[PDB]
Design an enzyme around this catalytic site. Structure first.
Site, PDB file in Angstrom:
ATOM      1  N   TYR A 107      -2.277   7.437  -6.347  1.00 31.99           N
ATOM      2  CA  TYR A 107      -2.742   6.393  -5.118  1.00 31.99           C
ATOM      3  C   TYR A 107      -1.423   6.255  -4.577  1.00 31.99           C
ATOM      4  CZ  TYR A 107      -7.680   6.615  -5.341  1.00 31.99           C
ATOM      5  OH  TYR A 107      -8.987   6.937  -5.357  1.00 31.99           O
TER       6      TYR A 107
ATOM      7  N   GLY B  25       1.845   6.813  -2.585  1.00 28.87           N
ATOM      8  CA  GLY B  25       2.298   8.006  -1.761  1.00 28.87           C
ATOM      9  C   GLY B  25       1.040   8.142  -0.709  1.00 28.87           C
TER      10      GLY B  25
ATOM     11  N   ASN C 246      -1.374  16.298  -8.255  1.00 26.54           N
ATOM     12  CA  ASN C 246      -2.603  15.974  -7.993  1.00 26.54           C
ATOM     13  C   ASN C 246      -3.780  16.461  -8.177  1.00 26.54           C
ATOM     14  OD1 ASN C 246      -2.280  13.907  -5.411  1.00 26.54           O
ATOM     15  ND2 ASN C 246      -4.152  14.848  -4.696  1.00 26.54           N
TER      16      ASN C 246
ATOM     17  N   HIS D  10      -3.310  -1.452  -2.238  1.00 26.54           N
ATOM     18  CA  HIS D  10      -2.713  -1.402  -0.946  1.00 26.54           C
ATOM     19  C   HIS D  10      -3.209  -0.364   0.229  1.00 26.54           C
ATOM     20  CE1 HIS D  10       1.508  -0.273   1.298  1.00 26.54           C
ATOM     21  NE2 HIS D  10       1.296  -1.658   1.152  1.00 26.54           N
ATOM     22  N   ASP D  11      -3.653   0.735  -0.293  1.00 28.56           N
ATOM     23  CA  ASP D  11      -4.350   1.502   0.834  1.00 28.56           C
ATOM     24  C   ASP D  11      -5.562   0.539   1.300  1.00 28.56           C
ATOM     25  OD1 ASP D  11      -2.577   3.523  -0.182  1.00 28.56           O
ATOM     26  OD2 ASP D  11      -4.222   4.858  -0.951  1.00 28.56           O
TER      27      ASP D  11
ATOM     28  N   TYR E 220       8.466  -5.394  10.177  1.00 30.39           N
ATOM     29  CA  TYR E 220       8.142  -6.759   9.722  1.00 30.39           C
ATOM     30  C   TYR E 220       9.707  -7.299   9.354  1.00 30.39           C
ATOM     31  CZ  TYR E 220       7.386  -5.121   5.167  1.00 30.39           C
ATOM     32  OH  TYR E 220       7.336  -4.611   3.946  1.00 30.39           O
TER      33      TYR E 220
ATOM     34  N   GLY F  41       1.125   8.374  -9.866  1.00 25.78           N
ATOM     35  CA  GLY F  41      -0.278   8.422 -10.122  1.00 25.78           C
ATOM     36  C   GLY F  41      -1.027   9.084  -9.069  1.00 25.78           C
TER      37      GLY F  41
ATOM     38  N   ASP G 173       2.020  -5.408   1.968  1.00 22.51           N
ATOM     39  CA  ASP G 173       3.214  -4.692   1.134  1.00 22.51           C
ATOM     40  C   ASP G 173       3.662  -5.767   0.036  1.00 22.51           C
ATOM     41  OD1 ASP G 173       3.167  -2.933   3.030  1.00 22.51           O
ATOM     42  OD2 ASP G 173       5.205  -2.775   3.651  1.00 22.51           O
TER      43      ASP G 173
ATOM     44  N   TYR H 162      -4.161  -1.718   4.096  1.00 20.99           N
ATOM     45  CA  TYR H 162      -3.835  -0.847   5.202  1.00 20.99           C
ATOM     46  C   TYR H 162      -5.092  -0.496   6.120  1.00 20.99           C
ATOM     47  CZ  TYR H 162       1.464  -0.331   4.567  1.00 20.99           C
ATOM     48  OH  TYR H 162       2.707  -0.798   4.690  1.00 20.99           O
TER      49      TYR H 162
ATOM     50  N   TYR I 270       3.055  12.861 -10.048  1.00 23.28           N
ATOM     51  CA  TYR I 270       1.872  13.046 -10.626  1.00 23.28           C
ATOM     52  C   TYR I 270       1.161  14.372  -9.979  1.00 23.28           C
ATOM     53  CZ  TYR I 270      -1.834  12.078 -13.976  1.00 23.28           C
ATOM     54  OH  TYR I 270      -2.741  12.346 -15.010  1.00 23.28           O
TER      55      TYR I 270
ATOM     56  N   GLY J 127      -2.097   8.965   1.222  1.00 22.12           N
ATOM     57  CA  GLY J 127      -3.582   9.078   1.002  1.00 22.12           C
ATOM     58  C   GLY J 127      -3.559   8.784  -0.590  1.00 22.12           C
TER      59      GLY J 127
HETATM   60  C1  7W3 Z   1       4.467   2.726  -3.147  1.00 16.52           C
HETATM   61  C2  7W3 Z   1       4.249   3.657  -1.984  1.00 16.52           C
HETATM   62  C3  7W3 Z   1       2.995   3.632  -1.319  1.00 16.52           C
HETATM   63  C4  7W3 Z   1       2.041   2.664  -1.702  1.00 16.52           C
HETATM   64  O1  7W3 Z   1       2.239   1.502  -1.903  1.00 16.52           O
HETATM   65  C5  7W3 Z   1       0.747   3.255  -1.622  1.00 16.52           C
HETATM   66  N1  7W3 Z   1      -0.253   2.466  -1.962  1.00 16.52           N
HETATM   67  O2  7W3 Z   1       0.657   4.597  -1.553  1.00 16.52           O
HETATM   68  C6  7W3 Z   1       3.199   4.567  -0.034  1.00 16.52           C
HETATM   69  C7  7W3 Z   1       2.388   4.795   0.772  1.00 16.52           C
HETATM   70  O3  7W3 Z   1       1.108   4.318   1.287  1.00 16.52           O
HETATM   71  C8  7W3 Z   1       0.711   4.206   2.466  1.00 16.52           C
HETATM   72  C9  7W3 Z   1      -0.744   4.731   2.436  1.00 16.52           C
HETATM   73  O4  7W3 Z   1      -0.771   5.742   1.921  1.00 16.52           O
HETATM   74  O5  7W3 Z   1      -1.481   4.145   3.291  1.00 16.52           O
HETATM   75  C10 7W3 Z   1       2.868   5.907   1.795  1.00 16.52           C
HETATM   76  C11 7W3 Z   1       4.222   6.561   1.392  1.00 16.52           C
HETATM   77  C12 7W3 Z   1       4.868   5.999   0.333  1.00 16.52           C
HETATM   78  C13 7W3 Z   1       4.216   5.248  -0.517  1.00 16.52           C
HETATM   79  N2  7W3 Z   1       5.038   4.647  -1.392  1.00 16.52           N
HETATM   80  C14 7W3 Z   1       6.305   5.046  -1.607  1.00 16.52           C
HETATM   81  C15 7W3 Z   1       7.639   4.640  -1.018  1.00 16.52           C
HETATM   82  C16 7W3 Z   1       7.193   3.273  -0.538  1.00 16.52           C
HETATM   83  C17 7W3 Z   1       8.458   2.649   0.365  1.00 16.52           C
HETATM   84  C18 7W3 Z   1       9.556   3.087   0.775  1.00 16.52           C
HETATM   85  C19 7W3 Z   1       9.727   4.498   0.194  1.00 16.52           C
HETATM   86  C20 7W3 Z   1       8.709   5.142  -0.374  1.00 16.52           C
HETATM   87  C21 7W3 Z   1       8.940   6.662  -0.825  1.00 16.52           C
HETATM   88  F1  7W3 Z   1       8.087   7.545  -0.376  1.00 16.52           F
HETATM   89  F2  7W3 Z   1      10.118   7.098  -0.110  1.00 16.52           F
HETATM   90  F3  7W3 Z   1       9.405   6.749  -2.424  1.00 16.52           F
HETATM   91 CA    CA Z   2      -1.590   5.912  -1.391  1.00 13.35          CA
HETATM   92 CL    CL Z   3      -4.665  -6.021  -0.977  1.00 12.13          CL
END
Ligand code: 7W3
Ligand code: CA
Ligand code: CL
Ligand code: CL
Length: 123
Positions: free
Chosen positions: A26, A28, A113, A46-47, A65, A24, A90, A50, A111, A30
């Site tokens: 969000y 990954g 951007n 989740h963003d 953790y 989607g 998390d 953080y 997806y 940003g």
């Molecule tokens: C689901 C998720 C994320 C999120 O929960 C989110 N809110 O963007 C995430 C992420 O978010 C933290 C942020 O953008 O503040 C950054 C990198 C990979 C992310 N991923 C994918 C992920 C997650 C854990 C371990 C590996 C991976 C990856 F990227 F290798 F698939």
């Molecule tokens: Ca994100």
């Molecule tokens: Cl939350």
């Protein structure tokens, strides 16, 4: 420093963590515009989580953790309060993913951007 979250995601969803990256608008790094679906809202939340942790002095992108999973659920731990807070953000996300497994759509993985349109909802 995302080994623990990925492992949490896999335990809770039965999918590889790779299935939630670039999901989607969000999931990954940003994100922006309007979430495509409920799983994406998890990542938006989740963003936000953080950002709250960063304003507390934590570095949730880097924190390491400890956690386990039983039937009672996910148990979070760590030497510092920041590590424990990271685990809580998390955990809420992984639970949110599991809960919305029913509307997970493979078409939103990776997806583009440019398909992200609309306003950016506030935290
Ligand atoms: C689901 C998720 C994320 C999120 O929960 C989110 N809110 O963007 C995430 C992420 O978010 C933290 C942020 O953008 O503040 C950054 C990198 C990979 C992310 N991923 C994918 C992920 C997650 C854990 C371990 C590996 C991976 C990856 F990227 F290798 F698939
Ligand atoms: Ca994100
Ligand atoms: Cl939350
Ligand atoms: Cl430590």
């Amino acid at each position: 420093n995302l080994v623990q979250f990925g492992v949490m995601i896999e335990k809770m969803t039965g999918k590889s963590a790779l299935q939630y990256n670039d999901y989607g608008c969000y999931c990954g790094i940003g994100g922006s515009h309007w979430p495509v679906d409920q799983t994406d809202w998890c990542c938006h939340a989740h963003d936000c989580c953080y950002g709250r942790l960063e304003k507390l002095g934590c570095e949730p992108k880097l924190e390491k953790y400890l956690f386990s999973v039983s039937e009672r659920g996910i148990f979070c731990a760590g030497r510092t309060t920041c590590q424990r807070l990271t685990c809580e953000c998390d955990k809420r996300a992984a639970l949110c993913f599991r809960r919305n497994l029913g509307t997970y759509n493979r078409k939103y993985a990776h997806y583009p951007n440019k398909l992200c349109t609309g306003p950016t909802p506030p935290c």
